[PDB]
Amino acid sequence: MTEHFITLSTTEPNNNIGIVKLRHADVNSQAIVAQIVENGQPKNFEGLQPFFCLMAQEATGQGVSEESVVSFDAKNGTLKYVASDNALQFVGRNEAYFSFRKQEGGRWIEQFSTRTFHYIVEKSIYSQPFKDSNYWWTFKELYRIFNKYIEDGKKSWEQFVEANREILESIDPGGVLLAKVIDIEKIVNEKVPAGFKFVLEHDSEYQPEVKVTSYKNAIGTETDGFDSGPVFGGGTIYNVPVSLSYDRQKVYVEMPKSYTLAGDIILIDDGTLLVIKETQVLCFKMSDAKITKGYVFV
Amino acid sequence: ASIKKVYRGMKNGAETINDDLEAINSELTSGGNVVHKTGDETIAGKKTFTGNVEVNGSLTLPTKSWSGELGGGIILSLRKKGTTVEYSIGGEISSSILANSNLVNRSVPNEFCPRNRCSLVGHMVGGWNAFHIDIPSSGVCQWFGPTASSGTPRGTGTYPID
Amino acid sequence: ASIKKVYRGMKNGAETINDDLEAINSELTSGGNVVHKTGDETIAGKKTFTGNVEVNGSLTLPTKSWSGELGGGIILSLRKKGTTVEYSIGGEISSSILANSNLVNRSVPNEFCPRNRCSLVGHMVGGWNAFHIDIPSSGVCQWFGPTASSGTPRGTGTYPIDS
Amino acid sequence: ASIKKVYRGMKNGAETINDDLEAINSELTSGGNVVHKTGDETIAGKKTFTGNVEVNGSLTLPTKSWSGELGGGIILSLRKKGTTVEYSIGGEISSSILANSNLVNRSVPNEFCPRNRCSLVGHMVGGWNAFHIDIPSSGVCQWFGPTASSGTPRGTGTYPID
Amino acid sequence: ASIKKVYRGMKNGAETINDDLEAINSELTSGGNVVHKTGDETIAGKKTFTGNVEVNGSLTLPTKSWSGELGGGIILSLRKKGTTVEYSIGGEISSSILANSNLVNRSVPNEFCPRNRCSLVGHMVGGWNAFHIDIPSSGVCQWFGPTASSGTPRGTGTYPID
Amino acid sequence: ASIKKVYRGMKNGAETINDDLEAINSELTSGGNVVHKTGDETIAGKKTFTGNVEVNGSLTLPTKSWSGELGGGIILSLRKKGTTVEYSIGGEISSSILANSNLVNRSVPNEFCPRNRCSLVGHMVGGWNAFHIDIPSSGVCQWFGPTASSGTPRGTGTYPIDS
Amino acid sequence: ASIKKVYRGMKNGAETINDDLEAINSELTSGGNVVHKTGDETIAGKKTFTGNVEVNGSLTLPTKSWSGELGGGIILSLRKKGTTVEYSIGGEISSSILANSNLVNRSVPNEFCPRNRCSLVGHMVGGWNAFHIDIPSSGVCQWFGPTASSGTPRGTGTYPIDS
C-alpha cells in the first residue's frame, strides 16, 4: 500500500507546512505515516489514544471528523493512519491534525494535539457527477440502485417459481406426481448415462478406460474464427457420466441424453477422439489403447 | 513508578492517592530505576565520583588471561586487570637465543600490547645473572640480554598498557 | 519514608497528604535508603557498574601490612591492597644462605600467600648481582640465587595473589 | 523536587497534588539529587561501599605524568594512578656515575615521592648486569650499582607512594 | 518433550494430539535429551561401546604438560594424553652425574608418575653413546648410564602410566 | 517402546493414545534403544563418527598382558592397547647370547606379533651400550646386538601391530 | 519421521494417529536421524563426551603412510594415526654421512612434520652403537650421531606431532 511520510511537530509554528494529497476513490491503500516531535525530540504519547482530526470545509460542527488511529507506537512517537471512506468523502482543500487524549468517564483529563497540515483530496471519476438518462448522477448512487435491482430481481424470481410450483403441486392430490416425474426425468437426461450411445474401436485385447468431457467454444471451433468466442480456449467443461460396456476390440460408451450430439468425428494420432458440431465438442480420452474407429449407435 | 492521574470529580480519590504514595515510597526502599543503600543492583551509565570512594569488600575488574612460549623455551603468563597487565616469566631455555634477537615462536596478542615499550626485568636461576624482555606495540618480543643456550627464566610483576 | 495511610472520610485529608509528600521529598534530597549526588553515605550490597566509572578523589581498598626476617638478615615488607600485594626487600645478609635453599627463619602468612608461585626480582648493592625469591602457596620462601654470605638485598614492586 | 504546600480549602486541590506526585515521580527516573540506575550522573561526597563492587566498563583515577634525565643520561618516566606510581627506565649512560652516588641533574617532584625508600630494579642491555635506584622523600635519586660510564638502562614496573 | 494429557471428553482433542506428536517428532531430529546423527551435541554419562568405533575427524583427550630440569642439566618435557605420557629429553649436562645415582634437582609430579618402573632410552650427540632414565612411583629419577659430566642428551617417545 | 494399536471403534481410545504418547516420551528422556545425553548406557554396532570427537573423561580400550623370558634371562613385558603394544625390557643376562641369533627360550604369542618387523631400542646398565631386538611375524625374537654374556637390559616404549 | 497432520473432522483419524505413532516408534528402534543402542550408524557433528567412554571393540583413526630414503641409504617408514606418528628406521648406509649433518636425499612431508623437534633413538646392527635423528618443523632431517660410512640402522617407536 501507498504511504505518506510526515514529521509533525507540537512546538514549531508550521500551521500549513506539510501537504498530504490523495484521491476520492482510494479504499484502504492511502496511509499516513507520521513522526511526532516536541522541542526537537520525539514525544511519547503513552496512555493517550491517537485520533485523526479533520477540518472539512462544507461539513463542520462539534465533531467535524474524528477517528481513532489503530496502528501506532507511543514509545517512539510514530503512527500509521489509513485513510477511511469518511476521510476520502470530502473532495477539496482541507486541514487535518492528530490529537492524543486521555478519556475516562465521558470527560477528558489530558489532550495534546500536533500542528495543522494540509489534507487535500483530489476528485475521482466516482466522485465527479455525470449526466445519464437526462439526469445528473454520482457513481455510488447509480451503483446502489443497480445492486438493488439485481438483488430484488433474484428474490422476485425465486418467489415466482416457489408460488407457481405450489399452485401445481400443493393444491392437487395427483398434481404433486406430475411435478415430481418431470423433474426426475430431466435429471436422468443430464446426470444418468442412458440416452446417448457411442462405439469406440481399439487395438487392445483388454478393457481400456474411457473418460468423456463436453465443452463449447474450444480452440479453433468458434463461429467467427479464432478468438471470436466469449471464453478463449473453451468455455465450461463438463465431466460426462458414462456406463462402460466391452466386447473384443470394441468399447460401448453410454452417456446422458443431453450430451447427444451428431457431428464430425475427428481421430487424433493417439488414444483421443473428438465429435465436433460447430462450437459444441465432445471429447473421448482412452488409456492403455489406440482408437481405430469411432461412431454413434442408432 | 507507575502512578495514576489525580483530577477533579474522580471516583475513589482517596484510594488513588494512597496507592500512588505507596508505589512511590516502595521505590524509595527497593527496586525501580534508583540506586539504594541496601541490596544487589545493576548500574548503567558514566558515573563521575568527585568525592573520595571507599571499598570494604572486593573490587572486580574485567579479567583476561593468556600464556604462551615466546621463543627458545621462555613461557610468559599474562593477566589483564583494567589498565594494568600482570606478567609472569617461566619455563626453561632449550635452544640458543642470540643477543638483541627476536622471539618468533609465539606473539603477544594486541589486547595485551602496551602503547609504550615496556621492559620486564627478570632473574636467571643459578647465578647473579639478570635479563629483560621488551614488549613493543606490534607484540613481537625481543631478548635484550646476552647470548644464552641454557638456564631458568623467572620474574613476576606488573606493566602499564596505556 | 514513614508515611500515613490515606482513606475516604479521613479527618485532615489535605494535611496528612502534605506531610506524606514532604516526608518523601525529604528522602529525595538527603538520608533515607537512597544514594544521593551530595553528602557522605554508606552503601551495602553487590553493585554492578556496566558503564564507565570515574573517580576524582581517592580510592580506598582493604589494607593489611606485614614485616619480618625471612632468613639470614633478609627482611621483606609486605602490604596487601585488594588483589595486589606490594613487596619491599631490605636489610643485610648476615649468615650464609645456600643456592636453591628454603628460608626457614619466618614464613609468609596465608593471607599474603599467592595461588601460583611468584618471583621477586632484586639487586645486590655494590655489583651487577641479581637475585629472585619464590613465594609458594605454603609460605616458606625459597632463595633461588647462588650461595651468598654477605651483601645488601634491595627490590620494590608488586605481585598478584589470585589466578 | 520542587513541591507545593497542600492545605484545607485550597483552590484547585486536584491539580496541586497531581503535579506534586508527578514532580516526585520524575525525580525517581531521571535527574534531581538522587543517583539512578541509568544515565550519566555526577556524584559528590565520601561514599563507603561495604559490599562487593563490580566494574564492567573502565575505571578512571587521577593521572599525572613526569619525565626527565635524573643524572648521567638516565631518563625516568613516571605516571601516577591513584596510590600507585608506574616507573619506566630509559636512555643511555653518557658520563661516569660513581658507585653509591647521588644523581644531581634532575630531582623527582614531591607529588611522585613516596614516604619510604623504594628500589627500582633494572637490567643493562648486552650482559647479565643489574642495577637499582633508590628514591627517598626528598627526591634526590641514588645509583646503587657499580661505577659505570657506558650502557643502556632499562626497566618497567610499579612502586607504592604511601 | 513437553506433552499434554489426553483424556475422554476433552475439548479440542484434535489439536492436543497433533501438538503432542509434533513436539515428539521435533526431538527426533534436533535437540531434546537424545543424541542425533547430525549437529554439535554434549553427552554426559558412562558410555560403553561393545561394537567397533570409527573416527574420521579429530579425537580430543585431557592434556597436561610439564617441563623441568631433573638433575645435572637434563630437562625432560612430559605431556599426558589420558593413559599415555609422551616424553622429550633435552638440554646439556653441566655438572658431573654419578653412575646409578638419583636426580635430586626436580622430581616428576605424581600425576605423571607411572605404576611400574619405565626406562627411557636416549642418545648422546656426537658418538655411539646411549643412556636410560628410570622413573618410579615416587618421582625421583635415576641416571643408569656411566659417570658423565658433559654431553647433549636427546630422546623422544611414549611410556605407559598404568 | 511397547505401544498399543489405534483403530476405528476402539474401546477407551483416549486412554490408549495418552499411554502410547507417554511411553514414547519416556524413551526420549531415559532408557529404550536410543542413546541419551544423560545417564550410563551400553551401545552396540559399528558407529562411524565423521565429525570431531571430544572426551573430557577417561577412554578405555581392550587390554591383554604377557610376560616371559625370551632367552638368557631377558624378560619382556608386553601389553596390548587396541592397535599399539607397549613393551618393557627387564631382567639380567645369565647365559651367552650370540650376535644376530634367535632367542629360543619362549616365543611371543601371535596376538602380540606385528605384521612388519619391529625394532625395540634398549640400553645396557653401566655403560653407553645399546641393543635392539627384532620381533618378526613368526614370534621367535632375534637379538641383533653383539655377543654378550652379562649385563642388565632396559627399555620401555611402544610398537605398532598393523600396517 | 514423516508424520501427517491431525485436525478436527479428519477422515481416517484413528488410522492417521496409529500410523504417526508407529512411524515415531520405528525411529525409536532403528534408523532416522537418531543414534541407537543397536545397529551400524553414521554420526556427524562435534560430539563432546563429558563422562567416561569405554570401547570393547576396535577404535579406527585416520591413517596416512609414507616411506623414503632420507640420505646415505637410511629409509624411514612413517604411519600417522590421529595425533601420533609411528616411525620405523631401516635400510643400509652406503655413502659416508658426516656428524651433525643434514640428510638432503628425501625430505619429510609437512603432514608428518611435528611442531616441536623430536629425537628418534636407534641402534646399529653389529655392536653397542647408538644414533638419533632429529625431525624439525621444516622437514630436513639431521644425523646427530658420529661420522659413519657403513652399518645397518634400526629403530621402531612413536613421536608426537602437536605441542
Separation in Å, CA of C119 to nearest CA in chain B? 5
How far are the Cα atoms of A22, B63, B88, D57 from residue B109, in angstroms, in the given order?
Answer: 62, 15, 16, 20
CA distance G51 to F36: 12
The closest CB to that of G35, out of E35, E122, E155, belongs to E35
CA distance D148 to C128: 10
**Contacting residues of B for E69, CB less than 8 Å apart:** 92, 152
- Is the CB of C160 less than 8 angstroms away from the CB of B122? no
Give the residue among E151, E85, E68, F122 at the shortest CA–CA distance from G121: F122
Separation in Å, CA of E27 to nearest CA in chain F? 8
Question: Searching chain B, which residue's CA lies closest to the CA of residue C160?
Answer: B86
Query: Helix H segments across chain A?
Result: 85-89, 139-168, 175-190
How far are the Cα atoms of F118, G104, G123, G139 from residue G90, in angstroms, in the given order?
Answer: 10, 17, 10, 18
- Is the CB of B48 less than 8 angstroms away from the CB of C54? yes
Give the residue among E95, E154, E93 at the shortest CA–CA distance from E120: E154
Side-chain-facing half-sphere of G76: CA atoms under 13 Å? 30
CA distance A264 to A274: 8
3-state secondary structure of G22: helix
Q: Residue D16, exposed/middle/buried by CB under 10 A (0-12, 13-18, 19+)?
A: buried
Q: Residue D66, exposed/middle/buried by CB under 10 A (0-12, 13-18, 19+)?
A: middle
DSSP for G41-99 reads EEE-S-EEE-S-EEESS-EE--EEEEEEEEETTEEEEEEEETTEEEEEEEE-B-S-B-T
Show the CA angle centred on residue G8, arms to residues G6 and G11, nearest 5°: 70
Q: Cite the beta strand spans of chain E per DSSP E.
A: 41-43, 47-49, 53-55, 59-60, 63-71, 74-81, 84-91, 101-102, 118-124, 130-135, 142-143, 153-160
**Contacting residues of B for E68, CB less than 8 Å apart:** 92
Show the CA angle centred on residue D157, arms to residues D155 and D160, nearest 5°: 130
**Contacting residues of B for A107, CB less than 8 Å apart:** 9
C-alpha cell at E72: 645435572
CB contacts < 8 A (A, B): 6
| Cβ within 8 Å of G, E 26-65 | 28-29, 34-56, 58-59
CA distance B103 to B150: 16
**Contacting residues of C for B78, CB less than 8 Å apart:** none
Separation in Å, CA of D105 to nearest CA in chain C? 22
Radius of gyration of chain C (CA): 28
Q: Tell me which H or E stretch contains C69.
A: strand C63-69
C-alpha cell at E68: 623441568
Give the residue among F54, G79, F163 at the shortest CA–CA distance from E57: F54
Q: What own/partner pairs with CB < 8 Å and gap ≥ 24 does B10-17 have?
A: B10/D14, B11/A105, B13/C8, B14/C6, B14/C7, B14/C8, B14/C10, B14/C13, B15/C6, B15/C7, B15/C8, B17/C6, B17/C17, B17/D17
How far are the Cα atoms of A18, A255, C148, D118, E55 from residue C125, in angstroms, in the given order?
Answer: 85, 126, 13, 14, 63
Show the CA angle centred on residue D85, arms to residues D80 and D90, nearest 5°: 100
Alpha-carbon torsion, ordered D35, D36, D39, D40, to 10 deg: 10
CA distance C117 to C138: 10
Secondary structure letter of residue A121 according to DSSP: E
Resolution in A, one decimal? 3.8
Are B130 and B121 a contacting pair, CB within 8 Å?
yes
Show the CA angle centred on residue G158, arms to residues G154 and G163, nearest 5°: 135
Alpha-carbon torsion, ordered D39, C39, D59, C78, to 10 deg: -160
* Partners of E97 in the β-ladder: E148
CA distance F71 to G47: 48
List all chains that touch chain G, counting a touch as 3 or more CB pairs closer than 8 Å: E, F
3-state secondary structure of A202: strand
CA distance G3 to G65: 48
List all chains that touch chain C, counting a touch as 3 or more CB pairs closer than 8 Å: B, D
B7 touches A at CB < 8 Å: yes
- Residue found by looking up cell 572426551 in the block: F55
Question: Searching chain F, which residue's CA lies closest to the CA of residue E158?
Answer: F157
DSSP for C101-149 reads EE--S-PPPTTT--SS-EEEEEEESSSS-EEEEEE-SSS--EE-S--BS
Side-chain-facing half-sphere of C129: CA atoms under 13 Å? 14
Are C141 and D140 a contacting pair, CB within 8 Å?
no
C-alpha cell at A75: 514509545
**Contacting residues of G for E59, CB less than 8 Å apart:** 61, 82-83
- Is the CB of D119 less than 8 angstroms away from the CB of C18? no
E121 touches F at CB < 8 Å: yes
Give the residue among E137, E138, E141 at the shortest CA–CA distance from E106: E141
G160 touches F at CB < 8 Å: no
CA distance B151 to B94: 8
F8 touches G at CB < 8 Å: yes
Q: Tell me which H or E stretch contains B122.
A: strand B118-125
Separation in Å, CA of A76 to nearest CA in chain B? 19
3-state secondary structure of G153: strand
Separation in Å, CA of A110 to nearest CA in chain B? 10
Are E43 and F44 a contacting pair, CB within 8 Å?
no
How far are the Cα atoms of D17, D23, G146 from residue D12, in angstroms, in the given order?
Answer: 9, 17, 111
Question: Phi and psi for D15 in degrees, rounded to 5?
Answer: -75, -30
Encoded amino acid at G147, one letter: T
E69 touches B at CB < 8 Å: yes
- Residue found by looking up cell 634371562 in the block: F73
CA distance C146 to C152: 14
Q: Residue F147, exposed/middle/buried by CB under 10 A (0-12, 13-18, 19+)?
A: exposed
Chains B and C share 3 or more Cβ pairs within 8 Å: yes
CA distance D32 to C28: 8
- Is the CB of G119 less than 8 angstroms away from the CB of E22? no
**Contacting residues of E for F22, CB less than 8 Å apart:** 3
- Is the CB of E53 less than 8 angstroms away from the CB of G43? no
Separation in Å, CA of B71 to nearest CA in chain E? 15
Are C1 and C21 a contacting pair, CB within 8 Å?
no
**F11 C-beta neighbours (distance < 10 Å), count:** 6
B139 touches E at CB < 8 Å: no
The closest CB to that of E6, out of F18, F28, F45, belongs to F18
C-alpha cell at G162: 602437536
**Contacting residues of G for F124, CB less than 8 Å apart:** 128
Are E69 and E91 a contacting pair, CB within 8 Å?
yes
CA distance G90 to A92: 104
